[PDB]
């Protein structure tokens, strides 16, 4: 209840799923949280539910939305300590030949450039507060995934960008880290499974892909984010895996 | 002289630097090579120098240039076995706050989407020949680099995309691998060093960054590419480091 | 003060350095802690200092010492939730030709087999409590270090063993993770530096090896351990880097 | 036929399996090869079969056997250019609680210390020839394996030791690299499968564990070793994966 007391946190895509889990974890740690989302429904309800959280409508692909997000955060709360770049999307499974350069550009705009833009606008304030950046990447950036060339590329870019920015901001005392979740049960997971011939089988397969035998929860990603913000003062440029062990483990012609 | 006899290889950015080293290595292995470059000077001379290599002017950011590159390769040589996506650029050192979203988009167009576009157009022919893709990424995609947020992000994306496509093309017998060079002495390296206050010191520092005490050569990247194409039949989705050991090795307040 | 209330933790090598930092972090989280060490001086004082911590003399290379450590922990506290395998040593710098197979065997006994033995004896109790194992490995297991072939080998073994055991214990609900610290300012660090021609220069070089510009503290490793035990319920088989960014970042003949 | 002409190579465990594949690849590259094995049957036949290969009985766990192996190599051929540390063993599947410290020590003697001992005795000669070391590790050192805690630990140690020694020998011009194979069809693979309830199912599962849909061949590991010895002059401290993509790719309670 006090690990991050007096601090101000912005969470993008905070209206549902992992983002909402991160919002709740930071509020529970004593922080004030700005919920950014492009959709009003979940984030507005979350603002009413949680004392200490407020909602600001902001599409992270729109530079002027992001400029206003930062200026309103400072105007309302007087400081900025942590930026969690969680907004992102996974398209449905797509064979490589079914992808397009334009679809790839659009996914880069959200998953990569939206993270870049908010971070850039927030860094002057994070320097003043010796704050930190947390990017939500993905395990599949590191190990690959089938039928997801554009998505995987965007997450490889986020993980690498995290390390580069960690180097650049280290002299100024600003840490930059990422979390790479595996299968987390969220509305996006539920939506993608509903597109499949047998959604139930797809979900069962998703649970069994982890040695722990279940999918992860938004709250577990949230606890990892609070650790990185509040207690990981010698960690910068790390990739914190929250995957349940999915990356572990496993005639000649 | 026979390791890759009878095969046809396309090398992007083949007119100088690493690309030219790769062209030479494939010609020396017995292959016919198409040198793709946006600039005529080096590639045209290389075509006159090397029996077995020809030059095609092609800017990999221009989709119609790439369509013609593939169709002319097939028209002239009847098959396509290997695509080496080497074209790319490193901008001068840039602090994060000096970068722009537009500059980042432009670098993604070259370093990431040009690789994506040629690979996509070539894959139908690579499937027919059980051929392979070799992407030239960078060590700094894996470990980061200072004053290079956009560049590092593009190379993290290439390495990750390599793994995704390896998964997708494995059922069809097409391998997809990448090479991550470190400091290789090329005209780009020489150009970036010339921008520095003390170019000589910058170069000395570049040599000393490797345990081997020198920078690498285009020919060494070329030998790695020939290995991946011609002899690495059980390797797919790998990142082959050609870095001289730069990634190895290295009061409390 | 309540994150790990009601839990029982064993920390090997807990009498000074990182181990003592981990002991303090767990006591501060509400746990009861058993301090294991082969030397009485630091651990006995720590027991007098901290309500909630007790000291048991135990050399982790001696199987009967470890059997008694576990049986006394259960006899005194009725449960066991977490085992932190921190005991270990770094020999002075040794050129490869100056090492011996016997010295290598002895270092394996401590850094690898002592971790193995305690974990094995503790696992039946950790299964009953759905507890977890935390091994203290090293960044240099992943990236190498000069003049330390035996040490580096032992830490590569610990990190790999962590992943194997994570797979084996996942069906039983026991998580197994490791922390890989970089330069942490401890009595071992101070002792090794004192062996050098210029200890002050060695220390300055150690601080500058991290982008953060300082060495880490035992308390920071301790916070990472408490996170892994108490809040990382979807993490198993991970390597949590606590290195200050040392692994990030960096004529041809 | 000339890539490694005039060079002298020692391959441990060269009498069958991967080792024999490596022997054949080096003979085919023009080298003279010393086949080391603890068993006479396969290696003696291989010596009769291959002009350019000879067999020396040597158990790599016996220091005096290894001393004689090196001295006889020099006495007979006048130089030593490459040492391939391939001898090793995988025990049958063993649950962690079924392993013993003594069994673990014995496996370390073979898989780790035998590699260490030959490398140490060979390094003075490798320095004279600017030669190189190739260690045969395993993919499972990096990602883990079930029911194999000791084996996985030994291979994590080999991969890490490779990086440490690469750092130490870089000033002297000696490269040190490793190959991490995945499922390679060898007599050890066949022996382990024969211990299983359904050996046929075990083998089918082994083939399907790779995106390429088959196991690898000794010849493919051999080609990777010849590349590392003869053409990878800017590679040191690398881990070359020969795994067919096994490491790629993949309700909340
Ligand atoms: N769910 C998983 O298994 C999983 C695994 C690995 C990584 N991730 C990553 O975690 C993040 C969150 O995923 P999720 O499963 O919670 O997804 P989700 O779709 O359930 O939630 C994403 C939220 O982001 C918002 N958002 C989308 N585009 C936005 C934009 N332009 N501007 C502002 N907000 C925007 C959405 O409205 C939504 O509220 C994403 O980056 C995703 O790539 C998820
Ligand atoms: N030199 C190094 O140290 C180093 C290190 C790691 C990775 N790399 C990568 O290796 C690749 C080659 O680098 P280099 O040092 O040889 O560079 P270079 O600048 O010397 O050569 C690059 C070549 O690509 C061509 N090219 C550029 N844009 C193109 C386009 N749009 N279409 C077609 N051709 C185009 C250029 O005209 C040039 O001939 C790049 O991907 C670079 O990122 C280089
Ligand atoms: N200090 C660093 O920079 C650093 C970096 C990476 C990893 N590590 C690892 O962290 C761990 C702790 O290192 P440290 O710097 O705190 O060392 P330290 O020497 O300051 O403390 C080690 C403690 O372990 C105890 N110990 C040693 N052998 C023992 C045995 N056989 N049985 C029981 N206790 C034993 C010692 O008596 C001592 O109290 C080690 O595993 C080390 O390899 C340290
Ligand atoms: N087969 C695979 O799928 C696989 C996968 C990854 C790694 N590996 C590694 O590859 C290496 C070779 O494996 P393999 O499948 O060919 O095994 P194998 O059992 O078929 O052949 C091993 C050879 O080494 C010899 N050998 C064993 N102990 C020895 C000793 N003390 N001294 C000298 N020679 C000795 C054996 O007599 C045999 O000829 C091992 O290090 C193994 O760990 C194998
Ligand atoms: C939410 N998401 C996901 C999963 C894991 C990650 F690491 C990640 O970043 C995102 C989902 C959700 C449902 C199915 C699939 C999915 C699986 C296999 C191939 C694909 O193309 C997929 F889309 N992926
Ligand atoms: C060619 N290039 C390069 C080097 C290594 C790589 F792995 C890579 O992909 C590219 C260069 C060339 C000269 C100086 C620098 C460079 C160094 C440190 C920060 C920077 O911003 C740099 F630009 N980089
Ligand atoms: C405590 N220790 C250490 C440091 C970093 C680690 F990741 C680690 O596991 C241990 C020390 C302490 C002082 C000097 C050196 C050291 C440095 C370079 C070569 C060597 O051989 C060394 F011994 N290492
Ligand atoms: C030869 N070997 C092997 C396989 C892959 C490697 F990367 C490696 O280093 C060795 C075998 C052969 C047959 C079955 C198994 C095996 C599989 C799953 C759990 C185990 O305990 C096993 F023993 N492993
Ligand atoms: O829709 C799947 C899951 O999404 C998560 O974000 C919510 O917290 C869960 O209540 C829900 O079951
Ligand atoms: O310009 C730096 C270097 O670039 C390389 O691509 C050329 O092969 C060298 O001859 C040249 O010295
Ligand atoms: O000896 C170096 C350092 O060791 C740490 O374990 C102690 O907490 C510090 O007080 C001390 O300065
Ligand atoms: O025993 C399995 C396989 O082992 C390999 O080393 C041999 O080259 C093959 O001929 C054999 O089928
Ligand atoms: Na509120
Ligand atoms: Na020509
Ligand atoms: Na006490
Ligand atoms: Na012979």
Domain parsing of chain B, residue ranges: 1-253
Long-range contact set of residues A192-198: C-beta below 8 Å, sequence gap at least 24: A192/A90, A192/A92, A192/A93, A195/A92
Reduce the DSSP state of residue D204 to 3 states and report it: helix
Reduce the DSSP state of residue D9 to 3 states and report it: strand
Whether the Cβ atoms of residue A23 and residue A11 lie closer than 8 Å to each other: yes
Q: Six-digit token pair at D164? A: 């440490």
Number of CB atoms found within 10 A of residue C110's CB? 18
Whether the Cβ atoms of residue C152 and residue D160 lie closer than 8 Å to each other: yes
Annotation marks residue A250 as catalytic: no
Reduce the DSSP state of residue D7 to 3 states and report it: coil
Q: If we measure between CA atoms, which residue out of A28, A29, A122 comes closest to residue A84?
A: A122
List Cβ neighbours of B116 (8 Å cut-off, separation of 6 or more): A101, A104, A149, A153, B161
Among A146, A203, A248, select the one facing D249 at the smallest CB separation. Answer: A146
List Cβ neighbours of B78 (8 Å cut-off, separation of 6 or more): B8
Rounded-to-integer distance, Cα B230 and Cα B31, Å? 10
Rounded-to-integer distance, Cα C139 and Cα C239, Å? 9
D107's enclosing H/E stretch is helix D101-108
Q: If we measure between CA atoms, which residue out of C111, C136, C138, C116 comes closest to residue C243?
A: C138
Rounded-to-integer distance, Cα D47 and Cα D110, Å? 24
Q: If we measure between CA atoms, which residue out of A234, A186, A233 comes closest to residue A87?
A: A186
Q: Six-digit token pair at C186? A: 């401890």
CATH number given to D1-253: 3.40.50.720
Whether the Cβ atoms of residue D43 and residue D53 lie closer than 8 Å to each other: no
| Chain position carrying tokens 């190189």 | D132
| Chain position carrying tokens 């709250």 | A219
Number of CB atoms found within 10 A of residue A4's CB? 23
Number of CB atoms found within 10 A of residue B92's CB? 11
- Looking at the DSSP bridge assignments, the partners of residue C56 are C36
Concatenating the DSSP letter of every residue in D30-68 gives T-EEEEEES-HHHHHHHHHH-TTEEEEE--TTSHHHHHH
CA D189 to ligand 8: nearest atom: 12
Q: How was this structure determined?
A: X-ray
Subunit contact D160:C146, Cβ cutoff 8 A: no
Edge-first strand order for the sheet with D82-85 is: D53-57, D32-37, D8-12, D82-85, D132-136, D175-181, D239-242
Q: Could you give the dihedral angle defined by the CA atoms of residues C68, C70, C73 and C76, in that order, rounded to the nearest 10 degrees?
A: -60
Query: CA-CA distances (angstroms) from residue D121 to A37, B128, C111, D70, D83?
Result: 64, 50, 25, 7, 10
Centroid of chain to Cα D167: 20
Query: CA-CA distances (angstroms) from residue A137 to A110, A116, A177, C224?
Result: 12, 13, 10, 21
Rounded-to-integer distance, Cα B122 and Cα C21, Å? 57
Between CA A37 and CA A42, with CA A38 as vertex, the angle to 5 degrees is: 55
- Breakpoints of chain A, after residues (C–N > 2.5 Å): 250
Query: CA-CA distances (angstroms) from residue B36 to B27, B46, B47, B70, D215?
Result: 15, 11, 11, 10, 36
Rounded-to-integer distance, Cα B218 and Cα D169, Å? 24
Concatenating the DSSP letter of every residue in chain B gives --TTTT-EEEEETTTSHHHHHHHHHHHHTT-EEEEEES-HHHHHHHHHH-TTEEEEE--TTSHHHHHHHHHHHHHHHS---EEEE-----PPP--GGG--HHHHHHHHIIIIIHHHHHHHHHHHHHHHHT-EEEEE--THHHH--TT-HHHHHHHHHHHHHHHHHHHHHGGGT-EEEEEEE-SB-SHHHHHHHHTSSSHHHHHHHHHHTSTTSS-B-HHHHHHHHHHHHHT-TT--S-EEEESTTTTS-----
Whether the Cβ atoms of residue C84 and residue C10 lie closer than 8 Å to each other: yes
Q: If we measure between CA atoms, which residue out of A109, A178, A181 comes closest to residue A138?
A: A181
Straight-line distance from the first to the last Cα atom of chain D, in angstroms, rounded to the nearest whole number: 59
Residue nearest to atom 3 of ligand 6 (CA): B183
Subunit contact C232:A223, Cβ cutoff 8 A: yes
Rounded-to-integer distance, Cα B50 and Cα D165, Å? 40
- In this structure, chain C runs to a length of 253
Q: Six-digit token pair at C18? A: 């990182």
Query: CA-CA distances (angstroms) from residue C217 to A96, A229, C81, C206, C243?
Result: 47, 17, 25, 13, 10
Question: What 8-state DSSP symbol labels residue D98?
Answer: G
Rounded-to-integer distance, Cα C160 and Cα D180, Å? 14
Pairing assessment for the beta strands D132-136 and D175-181 based on DSSP bridges? parallel
Q: Six-digit token pair at A39? A: 């959709």
Residue nearest to atom 12 of ligand 5 (CA): A189
Q: What is the 3-state secondary structure (H, E, C) of chain A?
A: CCCCCCCEEEEECCCCHHHHHHHHHHHHCCCEEEEEECCHHHHHHHHHHCCCEEEEECCCCCHHHHHHHHHHHHHHHCCCCEEEECCCCCCCCCCHHHCCHHHHHHHHHHHHHHHHHHHHHHHHHHHHHCCEEEEECCCHHHHCCCCCHHHHHHHHHHHHHHHHHHHHHHHHCCEEEEEEECCECCHHHHHHHHCCCCHHHHHHHHHHCCCCCCCECHHHHHHHHHHHHHCCCCCCCCEEEECCCCCCCCCCC
Q: Six-digit token pair at A27? A: 């509020």
Whether the Cβ atoms of residue B202 and residue B196 lie closer than 8 Å to each other: yes
Subunit contact C251:B207, Cβ cutoff 8 A: yes
Whether the Cβ atoms of residue C251 and residue C51 lie closer than 8 Å to each other: no
Reduce the DSSP state of residue D240 to 3 states and report it: strand
Q: Residue C42, CB half-sphere, CA atoms under 13 Å: how many? A: 19
List Cβ neighbours of B61 (8 Å cut-off, separation of 6 or more): B109, B110, B113, B114
Residues of chain C contacting B, Cβ within 8 Å: 140, 143-146, 184-185, 203, 206-207, 209, 214-217, 246-253
Rounded-to-integer distance, Cα D88 and Cα B116, Å? 41
- In this structure, chain B runs to a length of 253
List Cβ neighbours of A177 (8 Å cut-off, separation of 6 or more): A132, A133, A134, A135, A162, A166, A228, A232, A235, A236, A237, A238, A239, A240
Q: Six-digit token pair at A124? A: 């002057």
Question: What 8-state DSSP symbol labels residue D211?
Answer: T
Q: How far is A82 from chain B (nearest CA, A)?
A: 18
Q: Six-digit token pair at A119? A: 């971070």
Centroid of chain to Cα C88: 7
Rounded-to-integer distance, Cα C230 and Cα A143, Å? 27
Rounded-to-integer distance, Cα A99 and Cα A150, Å? 8
- Looking at the DSSP bridge assignments, the partners of residue D48 are none
Rounded-to-integer distance, Cα C176 and Cα C165, Å? 7
Q: Six-digit token pair at D31? A: 């080298």
Reduce the DSSP state of residue D200 to 3 states and report it: helix
| Chain position carrying tokens 């396969």 | D42
Rounded-to-integer distance, Cα B230 and Cα C191, Å? 52
Concatenating the DSSP letter of every residue in chain C gives --TTTT-EEEEETTTSHHHHHHHHHHHHTT-EEEEEES-HHHHHHHHHH-TTEEEEE--TTSHHHHHHHHHHHHHHHS---EEEE-----PPP--GGG--HHHHHHHHIIIIIHHHHHHHHHHHHHHHHT-EEEEE--THHHH--TT-HHHHHHHHHHHHHHHHHHHHHGGGT-EEEEEEE-SB-SHHHHHHHHTSSSHHHHHHHHHHTSTTSS-B-HHHHHHHHHHHHHT-TT--S-EEEESTTTTS-----
Rounded-to-integer distance, Cα A27 and Cα C26, Å? 24
Rounded-to-integer distance, Cα D146 and Cα A126, Å? 44
Rounded-to-integer distance, Cα A177 and Cα A165, Å? 9
Number of CB atoms found within 10 A of residue A202's CB? 15
Query: CA-CA distances (angstroms) from residue D42 to D8, D23, D38, D47, D135?
Result: 20, 12, 10, 9, 21
Whether the Cβ atoms of residue C204 and residue D185 lie closer than 8 Å to each other: no
Experimental resolution (Å): 1.5
Q: Convert C222-247 to b/e letters by CB count within 10 Å (16 or more is b).
A: bbbbbbbbbbbbbbbbbbbbbbbbbb
Q: Six-digit token pair at B70? A: 């593939």
Rounded-to-integer distance, Cα C163 and Cα D149, Å? 9
Q: What are the φ and ψ backbone dihedral angles of D206, each rounded to 5 degrees?
A: -65, -40
Concatenating the DSSP letter of every residue in B24-65 gives HHHHHTT-EEEEEES-HHHHHHHHHH-TTEEEEE--TTSHHH
Q: Six-digit token pair at C209? A: 């090896």
Rounded-to-integer distance, Cα C98 and Cα C91, Å? 12
Whether the Cβ atoms of residue C235 and residue C177 lie closer than 8 Å to each other: yes
Rounded-to-integer distance, Cα A9 and Cα A29, Å? 11
Residues of chain A contacting B, Cβ within 8 Å: 63, 95-97, 99, 101, 104-105, 108, 112-113, 116-117, 119-120, 123, 140-149, 152-161, 163-169, 237
Give the closest ligand to the alpha carbon of residue C107. Answer: 3
Question: What 8-state DSSP symbol labels residue D198?
Answer: S
Alpha helix (H) ranges present in D172-231? 187-194, 199-208, 218-230
Edge-first strand order for the sheet with B239-242 is: B53-57, B32-37, B8-12, B82-85, B132-136, B175-181, B239-242
A contacts of C224 (beta carbons < 8 Å): 227, 231-232, 235
**CA nearest A162 in C: which residue?**
C248
Q: Convert D208-247 to b/e letters by CB count within 10 Å (16 or more is b).
A: ebbbbebbbbbbbbbbbbbbbbbbbbbbbbbbbbbbbbbb
Q: What are the φ and ψ backbone dihedral angles of C176, each rounded to 5 degrees?
A: -135, 115
List Cβ neighbours of D86 (8 Å cut-off, separation of 6 or more): D11, D12, D13, D14, D18, D19, D22, D136
Q: What are the φ and ψ backbone dihedral angles of C6, each rounded to 5 degrees?
A: 80, 0
Between CA D135 and CA D142, with CA D136 as vertex, the angle to 5 degrees is: 105
List Cβ neighbours of B55 (8 Å cut-off, separation of 6 or more): B15, B34, B35, B37, B40, B43, B44, B46, B47
Residues of chain B contacting D, Cβ within 8 Å: 163, 166-167, 170-171, 211-213, 216-217, 220, 223-224, 227, 231-238, 240-245, 247-249
Q: What is the 3-state secondary structure (H, E, C) of D110-161?
A: HHHHHHHHHHHHHHHHHHHHCCEEEEECCCHHHHCCCCCHHHHHHHHHHHHH
| Chain position carrying tokens 């705009």 | A109
- C162 within ligand 3 shell (Cβ under 6 A): no
D8's enclosing H/E stretch is strand D8-12
Whether the Cβ atoms of residue A55 and residue A44 lie closer than 8 Å to each other: yes
D181's enclosing H/E stretch is strand D175-181
Rounded-to-integer distance, Cα D244 and Cα D247, Å? 8
Centroid of chain to Cα C188: 13
- Looking at the DSSP bridge assignments, the partners of residue A133 are A83, A176
Rounded-to-integer distance, Cα C173 and Cα B31, Å? 55
Rounded-to-integer distance, Cα D5 and Cα D230, Å? 10
Whether the Cβ atoms of residue C9 and residue C228 lie closer than 8 Å to each other: no
Whether the Cβ atoms of residue C4 and residue C31 lie closer than 8 Å to each other: yes
Question: What 8-state DSSP symbol labels residue D103?
Answer: H
Whether the Cβ atoms of residue D212 and residue B234 lie closer than 8 Å to each other: yes
Q: If we measure between CA atoms, which residue out of D246, D131, D250, D123 comes closest to residue D181?
A: D246
Q: Convert C79-103 to b/e letters by CB count within 10 Å (16 or more is b).
A: ebbbbbbbbbebeeebebeebebee
| Chain position carrying tokens 């564990």 | D209
List Cβ neighbours of C71 (8 Å cut-off, separation of 6 or more): none
Whether the Cβ atoms of residue B115 and residue B137 lie closer than 8 Å to each other: no
């Amino acid at each position: 209840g006090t690990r991050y007391a007096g601090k101000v946190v912005v969470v993008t895509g905070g209206g549902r799923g992992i983002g909402a889990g991160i919002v709740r974890a930071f509020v529970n740690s004593g922080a004030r949280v700005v919920i950014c989302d492009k959709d009003e429904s979940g984030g507005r309800a979350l603002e009413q539910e949680l004392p200490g959280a407020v909602f600001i409508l902001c599409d992270v692909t729109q530079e002027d939305d992001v400029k206003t997000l930062v200026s309103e955060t400072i105007r309302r709360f007087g400081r900025l300590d942590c930026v969690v770049n969680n907004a992102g999307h996974h398209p449905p499974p797509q064979r490589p030949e079914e992808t397009s350069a334009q679809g790839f550009r659009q996914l880069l705009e959200l998953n990569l450039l939206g993270t870049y833009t908010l971070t850039k606008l927030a860094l002057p304030y994070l320097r003043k507060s010796q704050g930190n950046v947390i990017n939500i990447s993905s395990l599949v950036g590191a190990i690959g995934q089938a039928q997801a060339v554009p998505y995987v590329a965007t997450k490889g870019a986020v993980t690498a960008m995290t390390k580069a920015l960690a180097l650049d901001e280290s002299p100024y005392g600003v840490r930059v880290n990422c979390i790479s979740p595996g299968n987390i049960w969220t509305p996006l997971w539920e939506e993608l499974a509903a597109l499949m011939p047998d959604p139930r089988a797809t979900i069962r397969e998703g649970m069994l892909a982890q040695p722990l035998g279940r999918m992860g929860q938004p709250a577990e990603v949230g606890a990892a984010a609070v650790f990185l913000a509040s207690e990981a003062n010698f960690c910068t440029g790390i990739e914190l895996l929250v995957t349940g062990g999915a990356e572990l483990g496993y005639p000649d012609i």
